[PDB]
Amino acid sequence: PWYSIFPIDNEDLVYGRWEDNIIWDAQAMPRLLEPPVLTLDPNDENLIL
Amino acid sequence: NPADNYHLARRRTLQVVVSSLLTEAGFESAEKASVETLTEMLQSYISEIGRSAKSYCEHTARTQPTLSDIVVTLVEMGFNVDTLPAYAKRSQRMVITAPPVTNQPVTPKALTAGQNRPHPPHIPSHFPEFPDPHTYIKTPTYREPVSDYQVLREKAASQRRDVERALTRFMAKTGETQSLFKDDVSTFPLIAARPFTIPYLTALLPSEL
Amino acid sequence: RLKPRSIHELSVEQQLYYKEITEACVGSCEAKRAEALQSIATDPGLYQ
Amino acid sequence: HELSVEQQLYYKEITEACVGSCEAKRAEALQSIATDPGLYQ
């Protein structure tokens, strides 16, 4: 398998803590959030680039 | 536990020996502390002819003891050796069995046969072989890239056709519509022709520049 | 900005091992099955 | 990477149809989102 036969999963979903973006309380929100830039992941097929 | 069975296979064989020697012209149902006493004097007696007959032969510059080294060892323990041929020919004489062996199967393992890797020249061939790849080998791996011009042209073409079809059907459904054939809003909807004010501005002017 | 091309969490020796063990465990040959079953039964790195 | 003008216009119309000017355009926009084949990208 010079190419992995098994499917490759979203590293951010599999590994990242997307639970730091859950806004539990609007007023008292523990972590100051920042604007997110578009990252255009190229791992996904169906995207020309 | 096979750790304490190294000692208890031979000390509980000496317990059957004392239990077989206290039954021959003698007891049944002895006290418990009197059996572990007598089998402690039995182990200490075999271990004392072991240390003293080895000492008597090695004093005479030898390494394994003959008969003349034990008949002087037993004299120095006060045994009166001559009474031993009469004791050996009892009719009450019994034999206590030797203890069982832990490895009864001996060879019950199918094993796991895996070979990968060789040896660097500072390791000779008689050392064990290097184990398989999973033990310590890691390579990253990526997803299969589709760099084919045919399927890229097909993907871009079909996505452009589908988005322009979706756009024109959405704009014909949410506005005034025409239809070449009767009752034709579902299939082939036309956006209705709308009058402007200055038609040359929407005709002649370029939109991408 | 493009996020880096990620790698699968298995190695290619591990992925080849998985392919061999699964193609042996579908029982085309019995000795192949039995080793593959013992390999499953005592591989320490068979987590992940 | 950048949206082509076709899908930029589609994104604009679909998002502004779900802000609350009228309900019928909202229902057609949600029935567009639910039932179109090429909305990736």
From Swiss-Prot, chain A:
Function as written in the Swiss-Prot or TrEMBL entry: The TFIID basal transcription factor complex plays a major role in the initiation of RNA polymerase II (Pol II)-dependent transcription. TFIID recognizes and binds promoters with or without a TATA box via its subunit TBP, a TATA-box-binding protein, and promotes assembly of the pre-initiation complex (PIC). The TFIID complex consists of TBP and TBP-associated factors (TAFs), including TAF1, TAF2, TAF3, TAF4, TAF5, TAF6, TAF7, TAF8, TAF9, TAF10, TAF11, TAF12 and TAF13. TAF1 is the largest component and core scaffold of the TFIID complex, involved in nucleating complex assembly.
Subcellular location: Nucleus
Effect of residue 10 to D: Found in a patient with X-linked intellectual disability; uncertain significance
Swiss-Prot/TrEMBL domain comment: The Bromo domain mediates interaction with histones that have acetylated lysine residues at specific positions. The second domain also recognizes and binds histones that are butyrylated and crotonylated.
Endpoints of the signal sequence: none
Organism of origin: Homo sapiens
Designated name of the protein: Transcription initiation factor TFIID subunit 1
Post-translational modification: Phosphorylated by casein kinase II in vitro.
Family: Belongs to the TAF1 family.
Subunit structure: Component of the TFIID basal transcription factor complex, composed of TATA-box-binding protein TBP, and a number of TBP-associated factors (TAFs), including TAF1, TAF2, TAF3, TAF4, TAF5, TAF6, TAF7, TAF8, TAF9, TAF10, TAF11, TAF12 and TAF13. Interacts with TAF7; the interaction is direct. TAF1, when part of the TFIID complex, interacts with C-terminus of TP53. (Microbial infection) Interacts with SV40 Large T antigen.
S-S bonds: none
Domain of life of the source: Eukaryota
Swiss-Prot record, chain B:
Lineage, highest ranks first: Eukaryota, Metazoa, Chordata, Craniata, Vertebrata
Record localization: Nucleus; Cytoplasm
Shown residues in whole-protein numbering: 24 to 232 of 310
Function of the molecule: The TFIID basal transcription factor complex plays a major role in the initiation of RNA polymerase II (Pol II)-dependent transcription. TFIID recognizes and binds promoters with or without a TATA box via its subunit TBP, a TATA-box-binding protein, and promotes assembly of the pre-initiation complex (PIC). The TFIID complex consists of TBP and TBP-associated factors (TAFs), including TAF1, TAF2, TAF3, TAF4, TAF5, TAF6, TAF7, TAF8, TAF9, TAF10, TAF11, TAF12 and TAF13. The TFIID complex structure can be divided into 3 modules TFIID-A, TFIID-B, and TFIID-C.
Alphabetized UniProt keyword annotations: Acetylation, Cytoplasm, Developmental protein, Differentiation, Intellectual disability, Nucleus, Phosphoprotein, Transcription, Transcription regulation
Induction: Induced with triglyceride accumulation.
Protein name: Transcription initiation factor TFIID subunit 8
Annotated GO MF terms: protein heterodimerization activity; RNA polymerase II general transcription initiation factor activity
One GO-annotated biological process of the protein: cell differentiation
Every Histone-fold domain range: 12-79
Species for this entry: Homo sapiens
Chief place of localization: nucleus
Keyword Transcription: yes
Curated annotation (Swiss-Prot), chain D:
UniProt modified residues of type Phosphotyrosine: 40
Domain of life: Eukaryota
Phosphothreonine: residues bearing it: 35
Subcellular location: Nucleus
Disease field: Alazami-Yuan syndrome: An autosomal recessive syndrome reminiscent of Cornelia de Lange syndrome and characterized by delayed psychomotor development with intellectual disability, hypotonia, microcephaly, short stature, poor speech, and dysmorphic features.
Recorded family membership: Belongs to the TAF6 family.
Quaternary structure, from the entry: Component of the TFIID basal transcription factor complex, composed of TATA-box-binding protein TBP, and a number of TBP-associated factors (TAFs), including TAF1, TAF2, TAF3, TAF4, TAF5, TAF6, TAF7, TAF8, TAF9, TAF10, TAF11, TAF12 and TAF13. Interacts directly with TBP, TAF1/TAFII250, TAF9/TAFII31 and TAF12/TAFII20. The TAF6/TAFII70-TAF9/TAFII31 heterodimer forms an octamer complex with the TAF4B/TFII105-TAF12/TFIID20 heterodimer.
Record's function text: The TFIID basal transcription factor complex plays a major role in the initiation of RNA polymerase II (Pol II)-dependent transcription. TFIID recognizes and binds promoters with or without a TATA box via its subunit TBP, a TATA-box-binding protein, and promotes assembly of the pre-initiation complex (PIC). The TFIID complex consists of TBP and TBP-associated factors (TAFs), including TAF1, TAF2, TAF3, TAF4, TAF5, TAF6, TAF7, TAF8, TAF9, TAF10, TAF11, TAF12 and TAF13. The TFIID complex structure can be divided into 3 modules TFIID-A, TFIID-B, and TFIID-C.
This protein's name: Transcription initiation factor TFIID subunit 6
Natural source organism: Homo sapiens
Taxonomic path: Eukaryota, Metazoa, Chordata, Craniata, Vertebrata
Gene that this sequence comes from: TAF6
Span covered, complete protein: 214 to 254 of 677
